[PDB]
């Protein structure tokens, strides 16, 4: 806290959807103590062995003969660190990995797979510390979530349909900050996915609701978008002090 | 930040500038100097630009488009095709080749835009290099009319013939390593 | 819109991206205040 540098405290862009922008303590700890957003989840950790076995099965020749070769072998498959070889086809590998994430065979919902198309690296991180959030999945310009899923969730009790079934169906997906760097998001389905003057026609995900970017204390603020920003921080601090 | 941009020069203000003044720090964050022009140069923009050029530090790197080192066995050989003409001209009445010539050639090529922006002259640059380094570096300069501004630098003629050194016949820093050291020195320390 | 301009008024209500960018600006102001207090206090003590 003693350090007066105004770099580590500032609200970074990557905090979107995973740490509350409003809720921070004021004083020596401005921006140094943060609070999770409402829908944020933190990875618990997993064994990388099944992912490595799948990669070995697909291709990912390791101990190759200087095959990168100006990255002719598109992408180098990384895991939690540990360059484990490289593949000639990166897009087929990425698509197969996403399908496996849906079927939940080798990839738990938390397993994070990032391909950097330029620089040609795929990172595949499962390291027990990543903070991720649920996002709806957009195929073409259509959300995968449909009336069947919503109707079953609406009957949630005595229908034995829950959020985990929504994840298993492949309708929603957990995305961490590294994957948030490689994903085109839409705030709302109707306003953005639908055909208009085409800003983007390659949306890959959709926000479940924007208001989930706020934390617990900032979520009680009514009409927070009509207040000045420091006032929402003040209300977070003061709502931690209300009597009830 | 939020300082009004009267000019394109940043200035420390506020608490940090008060700290600098109060502490009498030897190194100000933004040391600046306001210069007022005495004569008609103040009124006329071209003379003011002349003063600006005279007051602004310019290294050879700032005006150098690209530098190359070619091993040229003979000056008449002209390994680079382009210099074959002007080298010939300079060797129609060769000067300082009596001792010897360096087998290595530093063919610096200057950007015309930077040269004309700073209003530098090929004779000016050549004089600075040759005089400051001494007779050891011999420089051949192109005409400004030529499309490429080329300066051909060679190591000491007497040092190449080794009659002047006498002592022991042992290469010091070879010649190409010495030429690379010279190139770095010219790039960052010419102060044209 | 991409780089931070907020065209909506407070009465109209900021859109979500504008809301996040506004939070970034407010955070910077708060950090400035908190950092300022200590440096100014040290200067004042030295002068006195």
């Amino acid at each position: 806290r003693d350090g007066k540098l105004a770099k580590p405290r500032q609200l970074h862009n990557t905090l979107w959807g995973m740490v509350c922008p409003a809720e921070t303590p004021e004083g020596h700890a401005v921006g140094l103590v943060k609070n999770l957003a409402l829908m944020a989840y933190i990875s618990v950790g997993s064994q990388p062995s099944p992912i490595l076995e799948f990669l070995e099965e697909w291709s990912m020749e390791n101990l190759e003969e200087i095959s990168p070769a100006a990255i002719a072998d598109a992408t180098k498959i990384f895991v939690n660190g540990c360059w484990v070889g490289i593949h000639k086809d990166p897009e087929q590998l990425m698509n197969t990995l996403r399908k496996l994430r849906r079927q939940m065979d080798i990839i738990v919902s938390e397993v994070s797979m990032i391909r950097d198309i330029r620089e040609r690296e795929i990172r595949i991180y499962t390291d027990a510390g990543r903070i991720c959030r649920p996002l709806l999945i957009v195929e073409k310009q259509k959300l995968l979530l449909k009336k069947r899923h919503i109707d079953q969730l609406k009957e949630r009790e005595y229908n034995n349909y829950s959020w985990q079934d929504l994840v298993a169906s492949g309708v929603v997906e957990y995305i961490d900050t590294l994957e948030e760097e490689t994903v085109m998001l839409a705030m709302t389905p109707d306003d953005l996915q639908e055909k208009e003057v085409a800003y983007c026609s390659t949306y890959t995900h959709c926000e479940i609701h924007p208001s989930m970017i706020l934390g617990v204390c900032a979520s009680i603020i009514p009409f927070p978008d009509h207040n000045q920003s420091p006032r929402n921080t003040y209300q977070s601090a003061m709502g931690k002090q209300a009597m009830g | 930040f939020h300082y009004a941009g009267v000019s394109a020069k940043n200035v420390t203000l506020g608490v940090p500038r008060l700290k600098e003044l109060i502490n009498i720090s030897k190194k100000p964050k933004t040391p600046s100097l306001t210069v007022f022009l005495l004569g008609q140069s103040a009124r006329d923009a071209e003379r003011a630009k002349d003063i600006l050029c005279r007051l602004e530090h310019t290294t050879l790197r700032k005006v150098t488009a690209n530098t190359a080192i070619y091993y040229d066995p003979n000056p008449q050989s002209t390994v680079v095709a382009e210099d074959q003409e002007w080298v010939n001209v300079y060797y129609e009445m060769p000067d300082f080749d009596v001792a010897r010539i360096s087998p290595w050639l530093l063919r610096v090529e200057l950007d015309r835009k930077h040269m004309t922006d700073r209003k530098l002259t090929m004779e000016q640059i050549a004089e600075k290099i040759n005089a400051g380094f001494g007779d050891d570096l011999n420089c051949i300069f192109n005409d400004d009319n030529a499309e490429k501004l080329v300066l051909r630098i060679r190591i000491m003629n007497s040092d190449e013939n080794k009659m002047q050194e006498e002592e022991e016949v042992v290469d010091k820093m070879d010649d190409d390593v010495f030429l690379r050291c010279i190139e770095s020195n010219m790039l960052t320390d010419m102060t044209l | 819109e991409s780089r931070g301009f907020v065209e909506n008024s407070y009465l109209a209500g900021l859109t979500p991206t504008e809301f996040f960018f506004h939070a970034m600006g407010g955070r910077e102001g708060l950090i400035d205040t908190a950092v300022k207090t200590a440096e100014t206090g040290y200067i004042q003590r030295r002068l006195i």
Binding site: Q228, S229 | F1, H2, A4 | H22, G25, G26, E28, G29, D32
Partner: peptide, 8 residues
């Protein structure tokens, strides 16, 4: 939060 010349 206003502009570049104002405040954040």
């Amino acid at each position: 939060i206003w502009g570049i010349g104002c405040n954040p």
